Design an enzyme around this catalytic site. Structure first.
Site, PDB file in Angstrom:
ATOM      1  N   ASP B 104      -5.903   7.501  -6.431  1.00 11.03           N
ATOM      2  CA  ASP B 104      -4.963   7.431  -5.308  1.00 11.03           C
ATOM      3  C   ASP B 104      -3.903   8.549  -5.450  1.00 11.03           C
ATOM      4  O   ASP B 104      -4.291   9.702  -5.609  1.00 11.03           O
ATOM      5  CB  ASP B 104      -4.420   5.973  -5.284  1.00 11.03           C
ATOM      6  CG  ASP B 104      -3.600   5.623  -4.054  1.00 11.03           C
ATOM      7  OD1 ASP B 104      -4.136   5.046  -3.067  1.00 11.03           O
ATOM      8  OD2 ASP B 104      -2.398   5.940  -4.077  1.00 11.03           O
ATOM      9  N   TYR B 212       5.138   9.413   0.236  1.00 21.57           N
ATOM     10  CA  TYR B 212       4.418   9.461   1.516  1.00 21.57           C
ATOM     11  C   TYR B 212       5.051  10.407   2.555  1.00 21.57           C
ATOM     12  O   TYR B 212       4.341  11.050   3.328  1.00 21.57           O
ATOM     13  CB  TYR B 212       4.255   8.048   2.106  1.00 21.57           C
ATOM     14  CG  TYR B 212       3.120   7.274   1.432  1.00 21.57           C
ATOM     15  CD1 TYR B 212       3.326   6.623   0.223  1.00 21.57           C
ATOM     16  CD2 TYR B 212       1.846   7.225   1.995  1.00 21.57           C
ATOM     17  CE1 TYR B 212       2.276   5.923  -0.448  1.00 21.57           C
ATOM     18  CE2 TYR B 212       0.792   6.545   1.350  1.00 21.57           C
ATOM     19  CZ  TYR B 212       1.025   5.903   0.130  1.00 21.57           C
ATOM     20  OH  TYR B 212      -0.011   5.253  -0.526  1.00 21.57           O
ATOM     21  N   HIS B 271     -11.070   0.049  -3.057  1.00 23.20           N
ATOM     22  CA  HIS B 271     -10.173   1.110  -3.475  1.00 23.20           C
ATOM     23  C   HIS B 271      -9.584   0.841  -4.833  1.00 23.20           C
ATOM     24  O   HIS B 271      -9.350   1.789  -5.576  1.00 23.20           O
ATOM     25  CB  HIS B 271      -9.048   1.231  -2.432  1.00 23.20           C
ATOM     26  CG  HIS B 271      -8.149   2.406  -2.651  1.00 23.20           C
ATOM     27  ND1 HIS B 271      -8.631   3.697  -2.691  1.00 23.20           N
ATOM     28  CD2 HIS B 271      -6.804   2.487  -2.834  1.00 23.20           C
ATOM     29  CE1 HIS B 271      -7.614   4.530  -2.891  1.00 23.20           C
ATOM     30  NE2 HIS B 271      -6.501   3.824  -2.978  1.00 23.20           N
TER      31      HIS B 271
END
Ligand code: MG
Ligand code: MG
Lengths: 294, 294
Positions: B104, B212, B271
């Site tokens: 990730d 982000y 994930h």
């Protein structure tokens, strides 16, 4: 607010629609959007009531109207279902045909109503929206960031409901004030409290999330199927020229394919320009309705 | 957890990086992602420590590492800044070159570290990620819905921070467990409690949001400038085949233009497969590292 208007909770099919009715003349239905309710029309409606029988109604899932639990396919919150409620409300109030003005979700409901029941809609004004189909089909990194809630609110229940419910005022104020330093200035305090009081209702948190779930699924598919058709009554595309939408899309371009008789207007505000420009909003609407009826 | 590993808080410049170090043999740096920290490697690291000097570190903004306030341009949370921290950590711990495995955000950090300092990265394993550039340049309505948080977390501070802050556990559990029926099952309780300590830390809520915000701005731009460049060291694209990513993109297609020496591996999980398949993750990483070194 709405001094003199009649307040009514009308049963229509399997839901009850909350509305206020005032004035005289041809009927004019004003539909709000997210995260608001019919009180966004508190100043505009009394101004047009000297010439129209003005009905301001709450969409299903919002304000004082029924908020049923959303179905797994979200079909009970499509714009087809939301439009059906409002068209039946008008028929119950005695109006088989009527002019329609819708902001945000209310504009999307109006667009769908005009396609489903062309004979009932005398004219259509869509306020600060581009077609739902375009919003999704032409999404890019800029559109998705600007309209992040179109994707957050689609997450499966009860996730958005629980995240929002932990502090609804913070969550919705972000959707309403947006990010400009002007942001909260300009809202009328009384109308702002109506948005706040009504949005803290968990049933309304759920209903609005379902509206967005439907938007990206059932509504998108319905809209897709109707791309070979245009709304035929006079229509008005009315945008906030200082807003994010006017800035990412060209109104002519996204609406021309959907509207056979299109006029444009704008006010120098953002997405919630009706809150800051009540009198001028009423003026532009009155001029368009006059044009439409001519 | 991490029995026998040494706990170190290391100053690398203007930030301090929290990490654990164990084992012997070539250096191997394992980097976690969102919404986790170095504890996602609590079972994988001890298994690999019989043949590698394993360093598991917290990225800036996460776990026990520094979490500076994000700059207006988010540059202090770019993958370039996050990579610089980890490369300097390794140098301070005594290793000028090392193998790198990232999941990730950690895999994104690894890709950028290999582009910025190719000589420091002996091999690169990117776990369950497709390139940041592709995630944004090729977004569509399905991608945006699946990765809704890539857009919500970009909203200006302090909005996401306050929304998340009202109920961190609900917010991050949705990010970690997902929407499937078996969502929460199979996470080690000890590791989960460590992720939760981070979820509730306001400074980590802010740090991750800034990661982000940078991803959608500074990182996208840096990556755009490097299109056409391929990382040259041996690389592994390691995915969870039962997950969303694997379902919307083809690993070969999105990574081939970025990695000149590419191998593939997968496990039948989502994930967060590392949490569910620690022993098999270590087996696959060991096989790849051997191949790389050979
Ligand atoms: Mg809908
Ligand atoms: Mg970043």
């Amino acid at each position: 607010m709405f001094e003199g208007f009649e307040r009514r909770l009308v049963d229509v099919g399997d839901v009850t629609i909350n509305c206020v009715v005032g004035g005289s003349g041809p009927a004019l239905l004003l539909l709000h959007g997210f995260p608001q309710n019919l009180h966004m029309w508190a100043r505009v409606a009394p101004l047009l009531a000297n010439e129209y029988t003005v009905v301001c109604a709450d969409l299903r899932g919002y304000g004082g109207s029924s908020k049923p639990v959303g179905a797994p396919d979200h079909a009970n919150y499509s714009f087809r279902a939301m439009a059906s409620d409002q068209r039946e409300l008008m028929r119950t109030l005695g109006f088989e045909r009527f002019h329609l003005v819708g902001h945000d979700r209310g504009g999307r409901t109006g667009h769908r109503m005009a396609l489903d029941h062309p004979d009932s809609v005398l004219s259509l004004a869509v306020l600060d929206i581009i077609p739902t189909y375009v919003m999704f089909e032409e999404v890019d990194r800029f559109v998705a960031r600007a309209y992040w809630h179109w994707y957050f609110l689609q997450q499966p229940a009860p996730y958005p409901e629980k995240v929002i419910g932990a502090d609804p005022d913070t969550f919705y104020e972000g959707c309403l004030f947006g990010w400009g330093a002007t942001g909260a200035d300009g809202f009328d305090p009384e109308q702002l409290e109506e948005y706040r009081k009504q949005w803290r209702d968990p049933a309304a948190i759920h209903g609005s999330c379902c509206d967005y779930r439907a938007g990206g699924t059932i509504d998108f598919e319905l809209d897709h199927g109707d791309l070979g058709r245009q709304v035929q009554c006079p229509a008005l595309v009315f945008s906030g020229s200082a807003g994010l939408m006017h800035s990412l899309f060209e109104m002519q371009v996204v609406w021309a394919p959907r509207l056979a008789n299109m006029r444009f207007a704008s006010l120098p505000g953002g997405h919630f320009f009706v809150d800051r420009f009540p009198d001028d909003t009423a003026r532009i609407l009155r001029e368009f309705l006059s044009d439409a009826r001519s």
